[PDB]
C-alpha cells in the first residue's frame, strides 16, 4: 500500500535463496572434507610409485603399497556417496572429478606394471566401490575413466626414458605397443571438439617421445633380453 514495489520484489524469494545456498554450501564443505582424505591416500600411492623412475627392482613392492592405499579409497567413496543425494551426483561432482581421474591413473599404472594390460572401467569401478551405472547408485563416470587413462601416456613416456637409462632396453617397445593399443581405442571413439578431444590431442606428443626412445635403442641394436 505504502510501497507496491515491495509486493512485486518479494524479499522472501531472496531469503529462501539464501537458505537454499547455505544448505548447499554445508554439503559442499562436508564433501570437501572427504575428498581431502581421498587426496591424501592417492598422494601416498603416487609417492611410492615414483620409485619406478630410479629402481626397477622396487616395482612390485611399490605396486603392493599402492593397492593398499587404493583399498582405503573405496571406504571414503562410501562416505561421499552418503553425502550426495540421488539425482544430485552432477550437482556436486566437480568436487571429486580431479581426484577420481588421478586414482584411475594410479590403478591403471599399477595394473600395467604388474600384468601389462589396460584396466577396464568396470574393474576400476569395482576397486573403488563404485557402480558403473548411475541408476545403480554412486557411479564412476566413463569420461572420468577416459581422462584418467590418458594420464598414463605422460607417465609411461617418462618411464620409457628412465628404463633405458637403467639398462632395460626392452621396456620402451613394450610401452610403445601398450600406448599404441590405447591410441587405437581412442581413435575408435571418434571424439568431436570437446574437453575429452582436447586431452586426447596431447597424447600424440607422448606417443612421439616413446617412438623416439624405441628408435634410439633399435637403431643401436641395444638389448638386455
Amino acid at each position: 500500500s505504502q510501497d507496491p514495489m515491495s509486493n512485486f520484489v518479494n524479499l522472501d524469494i531472496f531469503s529462501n535463496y539464501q537458505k537454499y545456498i547455505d544448505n548447499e554450501q554445508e554439503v559442499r564443505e562436508n564433501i570437501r572434507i572427504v575428498v581431502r582424505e581421498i587426496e591424501h591416500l592417492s598422494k601416498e600411492a603416487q609417492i611410492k610409485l615414483q620409485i619406478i623412475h630410479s629402481d626397477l627392482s622396487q616395482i612390485s613392492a611399490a605396486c603392493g603399497l599402492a593397492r593398499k592405499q587404493v583399498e582405503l579409497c573405496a571406504q571414503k567413496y562410501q562416505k561421499l556417496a552418503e553425502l550426495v543425494p540421488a539425482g544430485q551426483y552432477y550437482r556436486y561432482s566437480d568436487h571429486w572429478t580431479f581426484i577420481t581421474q588421478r586414482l584411475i591413473f594410479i590403478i591403471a599404472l599399477v595394473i600395467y606394471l604388474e600384468a601389462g594390460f589396460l584396466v577396464t572401467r568396470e574393474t576400476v569401478a569395482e576397486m573403488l566401490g563404485l557402480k558403473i551405472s548411475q541408476s545403480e547408485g554412486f557411479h564412476l563416470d566413463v569420461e572420468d575413466y577416459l581422462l584418467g587413462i590418458l594420464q598414463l601416456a605422460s607417465e609411461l613416456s617418462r618411464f620409457a626414458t628412465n628404463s633405458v637409462t637403467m639398462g632395460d632396453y626392452e621396456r620402451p617397445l613394450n610401452i610403445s605397443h601398450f600406448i599404441g593399443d590405447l591410441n587405437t581405442g581412442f581413435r575408435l571413439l571418434n571424439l568431436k571438439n570437446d574437453g575429452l578431444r582436447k586431452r586426447f590431442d596431447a597424447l600424440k606428443y607422448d606417443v612421439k617421445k616413446i617412438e623416439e626412445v624405441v628408435y634410439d635403442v633399435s637403431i643401436r641394436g641395444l638389448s638386455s633380453k
Binding site: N7, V9, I13, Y17, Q18, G87, Y90, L118, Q134, S135
Partner: protein, 240 residues
C-alpha cells in the same frame, strides 16, 4: 593386429556407444534450448512495445502469455521428456541459456502486469522458482505418468537478474517516447531488485557477482534518467 575380436577393441566400442548416446542427448537439448532462447527474445521484443497507447497493453500481454505458454507446453515439455530418467544437473549447460531467457521474459511480463495495475494487481509477487516449476508439469499421453521440468533456484536467480537489463531498457525507451512516469516506475523496481540482490551472501558465486555488478550500473543509469527528468524536464532529458 588388433581386430574386432580384441578385448580392448570390444571395450572401447562399449565406451563409444555410451559417449554417442550422451552426445546425441546433449545435441537434442541444445537445439531445444536454442529455439526457446530465440522465441523468448522475440517475446521480450514484443513486451517492449507496451506504452500509454491503450489498445496495445492487454492485447500485447495476451499474445506474450500465449507464446510463453506454447514454450512451456511444447518446447520445455520436450526438454523434460529428454531428461526424464536423467540427472538434470548433468545437462544443465545444454538448457541453461534457454531457461534463463524464458525466466527473463516470463518475469518481465509479470512486471508489466504489476506496473499498469489500477487496483489489487499491485499486491502480486513476482513468480519464484516454485511458481514457475508449478507451470512446468506434464503428463504422458495414454495410469499415465507425471513428469516435470526441474527449475533450479540458481538458474532462476540468474534469469531474474537479466530482468533488470530489461527494466533499464524500458526506462530509456520511456524517456524517448515522453512517458516519464514509467521511468520512475522502472527505477523504483531496479532499486528494489538491487537491494534484494546485495542481501545475498554467496561463496564462490562468480556468475552471480558479475550479474550484481552489472545490475548496479543499470540502477545508476535509471537513477540518472529520473534525475535529468526532474531537473531538465522530459524533453531536454531526451536530448542527452
Amino acid at each position: 593386429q588388433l581386430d574386432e575380436d580384441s578385448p580392448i577393441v570390444q571395450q572401447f566400442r562399449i565406451y563409444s556407444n555410451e559417449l554417442i548416446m550422451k552426445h546425441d542427448r546433449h545435441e537434442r537439448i541444445v537445439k531445444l534450448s536454442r529455439d526457446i532462447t530465440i522465441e523468448s527474445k522475440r517475446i521480450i521484443f514484443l513486451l517492449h512495445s507496451i506504452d500509454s497507447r491503450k489498445q496495445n497493453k492487454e492485447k500485447v500481454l495476451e499474445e506474450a502469455r500465449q507464446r510463453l505458454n506454447k514454450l512451456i507446453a511444447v518446447n520445455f515439455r520436450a526438454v523434460a521428456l529428454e531428461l526424464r530418467d536423467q540427472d538434470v544437473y548433468q545437462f544443465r549447460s545444454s538448457y541453461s541459456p534457454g531457461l534463463q531467457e524464458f525466466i527473463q521474459a516470463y518475469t518481465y511480463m509479470e512486471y508489466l502486469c504489476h506496473e499498469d495495475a489500477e487496483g489489487e494487481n499491485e499486491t502480486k509477487s513476482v513468480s519464484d522458482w516454485q511458481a514457475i516449476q508449478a507451470v512446468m508439469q506434464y503428463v504422458e499421453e495414454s495410469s499415465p505418468k507425471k513428469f516435470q521440468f526441474f527449475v533450479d533456484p540458481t538458474e532462476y536467480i540468474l534469469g531474474l537478474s537479466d530482468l533488470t537489463g530489461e527494466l533499464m531498457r524500458r526506462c530509456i525507451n520511456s524517456l524517448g517516447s515522453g512517458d516519464t512516469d514509467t521511468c520512475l516506475d522502472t527505477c523504483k523496481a531496479l532499486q528494489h531488485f538491487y537491494s534484494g540482490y546485495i542481501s545475498l551472501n554467496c561463496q564462490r558465486a562468480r556468475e552471480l557477482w558479475r550479474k550484481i555488478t552489472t545490475m548496479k550500473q543499470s540502477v545508476l543509469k535509471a537513477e540518472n534518467v529520473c534525475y535529468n527528468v526532474k531537473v531538465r524536464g522530459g524533453e531536454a532529458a531526451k536530448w542527452g
